[PDB]
Paper text:
In this study, we report biochemical and structural properties of SACTE_2347, a GH5 mannanase from the cellulolytic SirexAA-E. SACTE_2347 is a member of the GH5 subfamily 8. SACTE_2347 is a three-domain protein that consists of a GH5 catalytic domain (residues 63–308), a fibronectin type-III domain (Fn3, residues 362–437), and a CBM2 (residues 459–559) that are connected by two short linkers (residues 309–361 and residues 438–458). In SACTE_2347, these eight residues correspond to Arg100, His136, Asn177, Glu178, His244, Tyr246, Glu273, and Trp303, with Glu178 and Glu273 serving as the catalytic acid/base and nucleophile, respectively. The conservation of active site residues and the distances between the catalytic acid and base suggests that SACTE_2347 hydrolyzes glycosidic bonds with retention of the anomeric configuration through a double displacement mechanism.
Additionally, we report the atomic resolution (1.06 Å) crystal structure of the GH5 domain of SACTE_2347, which revealed a unique arrangement of two loops adjacent to the active site channel. Crystal of His-tagged SACTE_2347_34kDa belonged to the P21212 space group and contained one monomer per asymmetric unit. The SACTE_2347_32kDa structure has a His tag from a symmetry related monomer bound in the active site channel. Thus, the presence of the bound His tag is not likely to have a significant impact on the position of L1 and L2 in the SACTE_2347_34KDa structure. The SACTE_2347_34kDa and TfManA structures differ substantially in lengths and positions of two loops, L1 and L2, that form part of the active site channel. Interestingly, Tyr281 from SACTE_2347_34kDa is positioned at the tip of L1, where it could interact with a bound mannan chain sugar, but also provide steric exclusion to the placement of an α-1, 6 linkaged glucomannan unit into the +1 and perhaps the +2 subsites. Furthermore, L2 loop (residues 302–315) in the SACTE_2347_34kDa is two residues shorter and shifted toward the −3 site as compared to L2 loop of TfManA. Furthermore, L1 and L2 do not make contacts with each other in SACTE_2347_34kDa, but instead provide an opening between the two loops that is perpendicular to the main path of the channel and above the catalytic residues. The space between L1 and L2 is large enough to allow a branching sugar to bind in the −1 position.
Numbering used by the authors: 35 to 348
Write the structure that this text describes.
Amino acid sequence: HHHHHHAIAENLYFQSAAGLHISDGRLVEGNGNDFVMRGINHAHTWYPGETQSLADIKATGANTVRVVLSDGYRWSENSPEDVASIIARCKAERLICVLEVHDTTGYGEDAAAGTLDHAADYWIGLKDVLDGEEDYVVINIGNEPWGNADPAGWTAPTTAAIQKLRAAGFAHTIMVDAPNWGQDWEGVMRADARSVYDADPTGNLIFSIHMYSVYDTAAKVTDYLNAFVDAGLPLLIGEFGGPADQYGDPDEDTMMATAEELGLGYLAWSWSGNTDPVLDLVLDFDPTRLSSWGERVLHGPDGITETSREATVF
Ligand SMILES: [Cl-]
Ligand SMILES: [Cl-]
Ligand SMILES: [Mg+2]
Ligand SMILES: [Mg+2]
Ligand SMILES: [Mg+2]
Ligand SMILES: [Mg+2]
Ligand SMILES: [Mg+2]
């Protein structure tokens, strides 16, 4: 006979603050399932009238969007209301959301660039919007937060910013970008990553490489990605390009193939709106105007539509 009981469930007395987290060098959801980001960057802070981009990005099959914010150091600060709206729209569309402060880009070289400390203060100002969204939102402290001048200087302020966010009570997975405009040409992030990782007492830290023309051969791509995997350190390709520019030709084929082989995340740059539209996946924010680059990223080998799996939390 069935026990025939009729109970109702109270929610667990104790639950973890962390949602998305790191386990054994990989990104995992709260339920333990491995998560491999396959997504797109959207320049929200510069295109407030293009928020339909989030739903259009989901329609590609993408499982993640990286949303460009400003902390007001250089561009126009994204308000807590705006950020709350974006997070909720991403959740409604079943997208994981990587938020990033762009104003740090090129610090130490570009005189208009802000500090990681200023970015951290901005994140702390968003705490009431962000707390409770640890299953859904990854905090990328500052985009490409050092230029090419003295990239060794990146390690101390990166470490300090992580510690400042943890001391403020953040339980999200935190993502950090490399010096040399995100491409880590001098290898400072690659060398110092373990030290930086060990400085996050939660272990919930992921490194992000941006692969442009420095990564113009197969060997350069595979060496970098394998370096992190072999060291047991979590990594994604948080931006990448592909079409040749004045500095070389990024090897997008090897990036995407190796990301698939190793199960590392990637986020293509970008949906639309670049000053030079060569990296626009769609022209004029219009899904019916895919560019050559859009065709490659969405529909080509190891691309988004082929490989992206929705986060299981949804
Ligand atoms: Cl706009
Ligand atoms: Cl080479
Ligand atoms: Mg029964
Ligand atoms: Mg939970
Ligand atoms: Mg909306
Ligand atoms: Mg060094
Ligand atoms: Mg290329």
